[PDB]
């Protein structure tokens, strides 16, 4: 089949997918929401135990099989073939949720071109009454309804939630966001139409730019006065509330979404070349660099937050407690507005966001567009371009549901419902099929001689008990404790909670309905049926 070619290009694409605008969006936000310092100490061990097996085993299976992500299960467990459609639906939901954020970032990049950025002062298009956050000398009198210029810019300019009274009420049209989505999808299509050649050609040029932007932002934030309270709040042990009512399950979900295992993209990337004697090293290097990037992102987030809190002369907690997605887009907005080096830092930060989001959504769409073609050979023969066009069509059609609605409500719903229980139980089914059903002995007997080292005594005991135990504990705790939704002082109703639970439990029903279809098409009785249907070809 197709070969990756440059090993450096392959590894760079893997680490560029590992680094995610979604991770940069979720990790520091939920960290500051749950307490800040009490998020990184019980983080690295869970990150290891949750991602290192799910990354290494998946990469090994991909490099051993090299037949895509949907048709790969035919040689392991054909009963669990519905996991391919599950991964497809989950990636579609992720792209539908991700394109709106990409459009927001690109619109911010476009609007950050004027010399007078609309973040230093509220203009003639926002509520100047609510707009009062201006750092003067004894001129601010905070009240129960005090807002910020960046908050108003995020609320009544790009999202326009003031016209939407909730999920039960529709919203107005957004032609600017529609054109932004059109441009982003055109770029994605022009980058994904050719194939793996352009895949490797576009990633290597947008890979070091986010890193250099992160480094220059860190070295800039390390100079502004007031970067001490932020790091002190970011480095507090706080051993009080991590035993039972802790945020461990949200940290696990976040690191899972950041490393992105079981999303089919890693399996599809490993399904190209054999990649001998480098699977373990690739997995470890990718996970380490992703964890380091997430740590640097959280560090700069908390540095900027502490600088803002010290300039405001108030605690770090009160700054954007209810703003879920708006936290970043108001904090960095006010940071650029306060720093005397504006009109360039905002531009480079938005360009870093655009590059990261492009790389992430490109890998996410590729992990499906190169996996469905293996299941559909008649399509893969000639109609690859038409199938790419059709999947782009349906992707932006699904994104239009959130676009026309004009609100981040569906965005938050997909943020804490799509990439949560659905992909969690998908990874659980994958791990169960790899460990219990498929023999770990014969699964490792080949990678042993392929990598020259013995993977025993760590994965032989991690893949069987601790990883599935944690991955099931997280999901049962999630199903037991309803994650109440809050956004912009708007409590989501019980009907919204029920709809979220329904979409979460239906985003993976394809696997059991395919199991039932296979059981009803296969004749006979239960025992012989299962013993001749669970046959790794």
């Amino acid at each position: 089949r197709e070969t990756w070619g440059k090993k450096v290009d392959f590894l760079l694409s893997v680490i560029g997918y590992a680094v995610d605008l979604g991770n940069v969006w979720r990790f520091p936000y939920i960290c500051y929401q749950n307490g800040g310092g009490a998020f990184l100490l019980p983080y690295t061990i869970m990150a290891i135990f949750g991602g290192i097996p799910l990354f290494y085993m998946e990469l090994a299976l991909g490099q051993y099989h090299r037949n895509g992500c949907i048709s790969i299960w035919r040689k392991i467990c054909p009963i669990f073939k519905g996991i391919g459609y599950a991964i497809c639906i989950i990636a579609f939901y992720i792209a539908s949720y991700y394109n709106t954020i990409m459009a927001w970032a690109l619109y911010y990049l476009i609007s950050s071109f004027t010399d007078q950025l609309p973040w230093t002062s509220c203009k003639n298009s926002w509520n100047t009454g609510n707009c009062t956050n201006y750092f003067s000398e004894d001129n601010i009198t905070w009240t129960l309804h005090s807002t910020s210029p960046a908050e108003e810019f995020y609320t009544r300019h790009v999202l326009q939630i003031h016209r939407s009274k909730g999920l039960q009420d529709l919203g107005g049209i957004s032609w600017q966001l529609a054109l932004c989505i059109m441009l982003i999808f055109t770029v994605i299509y022009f980058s994904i139409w050719k194939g793996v050649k352009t895949s490797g050609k576009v990633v290597w040029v947008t890979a070091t730019f986010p890193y250099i932007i992160l480094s220059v932002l860190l070295v800039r934030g390390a100079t502004l006065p007031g970067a001490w309270r932020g790091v002190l709040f970011y480095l507090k042990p706080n051993w009080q509330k991590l035993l039972e009512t802790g945020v461990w399950i949200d940290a696990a979900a976040q690191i899972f979404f950041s490393l992105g295992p079981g999303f089919g993209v890693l399996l599809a990337f490993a399904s190209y070349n054999k990649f001998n004697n480098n699977c373990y090293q690739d997995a470890l290097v990718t996970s380490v660099v992703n964890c380091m990037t997430s740590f640097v992102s959280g560090f700069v987030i908390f540095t900027v937050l502490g600088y803002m809190a010290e300039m405001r002369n108030e605690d770090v907690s009160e700054v954007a407690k209810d703003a879920g997605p708006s936290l970043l887009f108001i904090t960095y907005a006010e940071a650029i507005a306060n720093m005397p080096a504006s009109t360039f830092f905002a531009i480079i930060f938005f360009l870093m966001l655009i590059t990261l989001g492009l790389d992430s959504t490109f890998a996410g769409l590729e992990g499906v567009i190169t996996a469905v073609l293996d299941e559909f050979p008649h399509v893969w023969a000639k109609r690859r371009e038409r199938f790419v066009l059709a999947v782009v069509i349906t992707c932006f059609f699904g994104s239009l549901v959130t676009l026309t609605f004009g609100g981040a409500y569906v965005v938050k719903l997909l943020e804490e419902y799509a990439t949560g229980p659905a992909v969690l139980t998908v990874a659980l089914i994958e791990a169960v099929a790899v460990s219990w059903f498929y023999g770990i002995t014969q699964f490792c007997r080949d990678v042993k001689e392929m990598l020259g080292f013995s993977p025993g005594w760590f994965w032989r005991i991690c893949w069987v008990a601790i990883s599935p135990l944690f991955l099931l504990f997280i999901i049962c705790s999630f199903l037991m404790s309803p994650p109440q939704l809050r956004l912009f002082q708007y409590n989501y109703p019980y009907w919204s909670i029920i709809l979220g639970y329904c979409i979460g439990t239906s985003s993976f029903i394809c696997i059991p309905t395919y199991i039932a279809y296979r059981l009803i098409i296969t004749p006979g009785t239960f025992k012989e049926r299962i013993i001749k249907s669970i046959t790794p070809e």
Partner: antibody
Amino acid sequence: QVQLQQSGPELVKLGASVRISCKASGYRFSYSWMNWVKQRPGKGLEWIGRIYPGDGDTKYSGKFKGKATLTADKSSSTVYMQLSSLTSEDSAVYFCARSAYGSEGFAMDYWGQGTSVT
Amino acid sequence: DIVLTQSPASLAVSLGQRATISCRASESVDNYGISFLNWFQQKPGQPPKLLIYAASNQGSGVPARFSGSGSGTYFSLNIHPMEEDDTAVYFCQQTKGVSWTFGGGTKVEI
């Protein structure tokens, strides 16, 4: 409240320059715009320009940017309008309005007494 | 610069009947769901007085007899039958950026 007090009447000569003051008080004048209108005797209203005290943002229009200039004073809470090349055509009475907030549509709720500059 | 036009120019209606004031333009001033339009009450000698908030809401201190609605290009000012003192000229103001222009003016008399 309604405290947009202005000065008395001025004298107009061919090629002169006058200054019209506008004392603002009773609200956050550092975050609200200040508008200036022009009304001729027996004619309708004409817009001159707007000024945002606190940031110096000015947006002149109405073919008046060549002879009018707005200046804000946060220390004295006054709004000044610099005039130049006065003529009997534009010699009329000028007011001093105050724009509302964003959700209110920037409506001139509070007005001044009026400077009968003739 | 966006120009506003008013029609009719004079309304010689008596006491006891309602009237309508029109303020048309190429815009389409609707932005963020807020119709940028303001109606003023200018009496001879007296400064103008604000009547309508964003062409949909009533102002402060104005009696409930003043009202009006509209969307996009077409804007109307449905006024209750006026009294012997409510006779005055009315202007419509467009507050959409970046330039602000006033209307012509109607001669509401009895």
